[PDB]
Symmetry: D3
Subunit: 227 residues, 6 copies
């Protein structure tokens, strides 16, 4: 495809989607066997290998709705990908959310215009695939993680001049802020495929220090993927 | 309160919220014991009684975001209600959704302006309480119902001149259209209380004939409430 | 129709539209002769009878743009109704407006999205039928009422977190806030029929205690209707 | 003021506001006695004289919301003007509106952003002063004119690429299109003064040939002004 | 055309566009030879004459996007005009911009809705013709003027209740506020013709006293026009 | 900073900003001497070296407004960068724009919401620094390149369902589509620093095959930077 140099068939139907391509490399090296690298265009590493005997891929997305939209469109439309699980970081914005919590996004709020363009006059609420959500939730519960299922903010603007609205969203239960989920969930819904975002809380708005938790999160995402 | 003539303490902390006040009367008569009627202002019947020994209420909301917002604000702010479960009807707009399916709304899209006023520049995605959602889903699964967990449209406009956008939403996986969930979920989040919408599919866009399914739905909503 | 169980011909071409269905019952019992009740679906009482020898109806609408839109669409499109007069309550938001004043809405402002959907990029100003307006104004003047003809706000949100905008509207002469007029006036214009809203001021933002004034208002609305 | 070179006291408290400054000159020459010209800045002629013994002014406004807003702000804030009556032309957009009809605007729709800036999230419906409206309506009725009281569109865009929305507005009863009323009515409301627009229909979208009708219109506007 | 009484061929392909028609008269009298006046409709004077032997026109536009849009549409579509240079005034809103500076607008911000109607969901940035821009910049540099090339605000609202946003725009480098450029640049782009705005700073937000600078500006605009 | 692991002083005050970090590596290897790599966080390579004896940096930005905003905010606020020149690719959307043309963006249109959040009710037109623009234009003219100075679209959505609006923008002279310029220009203006985007046309909507042109573009960007 335009931004992925893989041949047809090189990318598995289930894929993990970190924002950081170097985390894709870490995931492939740490968890997968029989690994190949199918992409290095723009340094946006993608790998395919096996986990517990099942073929799976891991693909960096970059940061922000426009970047992840490119990769997700290409993966779905050009490579036949069916199960897409973002594995990322986020910043807590609700008072009771703690560093190293795992957040499974049911839905996402956004300051992006991407859905207002598509659905003028409407507020589109992008929704997780419930099947994947339940699988990841059950896996994380079994593994003994602090898992929080709820709402997140997908932000275009990492550095805001005013945080009043972000605080207000936290007052309405929005758990954390990240930069991808609205696009992943919307595009998966568009194409009738299955998406989920699983996030580790890395800081509070108002990699080795979370490597163990991060590993456990990757494990439940892979678990939900290989089912 | 302004629209509810109940004394303090007369309304239980868990409440079912049909749109039709006559369905509130039906629910009270059919399922509850030791029933009283605490409201008839505007004919918007509300009742309190016991179910499997636990005190619960049932309150009509009327149709539309503005009507349900009035009742939900008063219930939460004036009567200390903590668990609110809408039990309603909806019209299918996604091709695979069938009449008599039960839909548990994870989130809701809307053509209402109510959240754009509160969060200018943002798309707010109102989210169910996951705890209640899981309880209702597990109850409906155990009971052998066709339960679908996903996205719904909360519409201001029942009679639209153009259905192009509603069709487009169905193409993005939105299951059905109803007229309340955005407000219930948003207000519950605002006040830190717990909400869910459970809906029976009554027709396809493109009461006795569903009384058995409707009863089973009321049963899982009560089950999720009394836990 | 979907929400009205009347047979063809049971609803008169002129109709009064209180928000409260119990006020429809009061109006029918107090003012009309040879009364029948043609609807009790959702408790939304509707009646037909005679006033000064002329056949007229009275139909509850519920609260809010979405609720009244349902009823008005059905009345116009399924029952051939031609003259529709809302008879309601409102809250004063302009300093000189007093409790028990009668307000005849020339037009309405709104926080609803219903007209932005229909006319993207435009501000639609819903207008009363001038003929009905003049008839009601002349009747109220003759009857010796305090009648104020002007602008109102049709609100989706009865309980607002911030009242800054409502105050600002009052500073621009908007008289009072209610929850229906934008929809009534817009739909009547759409279908080429005649609408008016006549309102009693029940409180100031910043039923027996107004029963005499309320009666006098019902009288001028009926007068404007039977002409 | 910035755009009017008049001394304090030179402009009367009642003023007619044609868009065309040469029509201000025509009105002054044809109807007024003891006339002076108080402004020629930007050629935007303004005059003061007497009509039926009462002092009145006539001031060009130019075309469009931004131009008339300048003049109306200055007249109200710097010159103490209290009664402002636009006397203009318009193009019919509703099928039953005829050339040479006189339209008295109750309210105005707009494609301008001027009120969305002031009232974010709201649709502001600018309203005529009813007192002036009634006076002009009664005068025009007595004079035997075809007077139509209703809604108009205040357009920013005289030459539109697509007229679909203008046609749709006509289908919702909007009578004609002009380029000033939203601003006049909004600013008059802001400052607690009295405004009206009286318009002659000059063409149908889909000066000597209307000089007699135009004169009769000027006469009723002056009549409403001198009361 | 509707607002210009010129015959075909009477208006030159290059035209200067002051807002003030009396400045059009000044320009024609001061700079042009063999002058005729081709329009006085609405007092909006237009002239054609010769400058350094080349035929050129000068046409008032009035104030505001809607007024200039009318004239520019007619000039382009009915009179075949190809090079359009606004020569106007502006108010400084950025701290380093001085009275009598000449500002050449690269682009313009706006509070107008005119481009949101045409490009829903997009921010359209109207751009100068670079060829004309370079010619005017080089001419002004040669002439020894203080020329500033940058961003301006095209305002609908000359008298704003709050100047917070205007100050914020100045903090983002927007140089000055005026009332025409967005429309001129957008319409020229629509029709594939060439536009520029050259402005003299007349005051700071937070004719003889600038007649020399104003003349020098007219000179560089004519220079850019006759090339 | 959060996304750049450089020490204070390691990044030069003038920087080139390709979207592709591997193009940053190419630029450093091909054009710069005495090179170090100061960042590999997220694979987003950044380098500092010397060009014609002057210290300069080159930093990947990733794709899309949110990604480039992160890097530009950090470069300006944490590293004291003063001159920022994007060197990127774009797709032609105006009929006369050719592959391998160099486009220097005067301004940018966008489908992003980033400026509507900051300037509610306004269209913000992000503007290039004219000084840098002129330097790059003069350098490209001297070098004999096809340089086009004009408007571009900064898109969030690379894969659009409907291209109607993109075509319409091309009809209004918008030259090409890319995914960064609005953010670069807006943030540079916010902080009072200097930005420009220079783009090579890589395809038409409706790396070695452009390596020579791409090199020439890098050369003029470096030229404009080292002045």
């Amino acid at each position: 495809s335009v931004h992925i140099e893989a041949k047809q068939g090189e990318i598995a139907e289930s894929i993990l989607l970190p924002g950081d391509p170097l985390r894709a490399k870490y995931i492939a090296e740490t968890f997968l066997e029989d690994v190949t690298c199918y992409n290095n265009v723009r340094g946006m590493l993608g790998f395919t290998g096996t986990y517990k005997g099942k073929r799976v891929s891991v693909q960096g997305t970059g940061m922000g709705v426009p970047s992840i939209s490119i990769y997700v469109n290409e993966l779905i439309q050009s490579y036949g990908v069916k199960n897409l699980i973002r594995v990322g970081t986020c910043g807590a914005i609700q008072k009771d959310v703690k560093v190293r919590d795992v957040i499974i996004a049911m839905t996402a709020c956004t300051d992006s215009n991407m859905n207002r363009l598509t659905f003028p006059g409407f507020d589109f609420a992008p929704a997780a695939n419930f099947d994947l959500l339940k699988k990841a939730y059950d896996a994380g519960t079994e593994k003994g993680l602090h898992v929080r299922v709820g709402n997140v903010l997908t932000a275009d603007v990492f550095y805001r001049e005013s945080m009043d609205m972000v605080k207000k969203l936290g007052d309405y239960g929005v758990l954390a802020v990240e930069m991808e989920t609205t696009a992943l969930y919307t595009l998966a819904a568009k194409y009738g495929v299955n998406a989920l975002s699983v996030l580790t809380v890395s800081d509070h708005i108002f990699s080795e220090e979370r490597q163990t938790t991060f590993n456990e999160m990757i494990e439940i995402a892979l678990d939900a993927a290989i089912q």
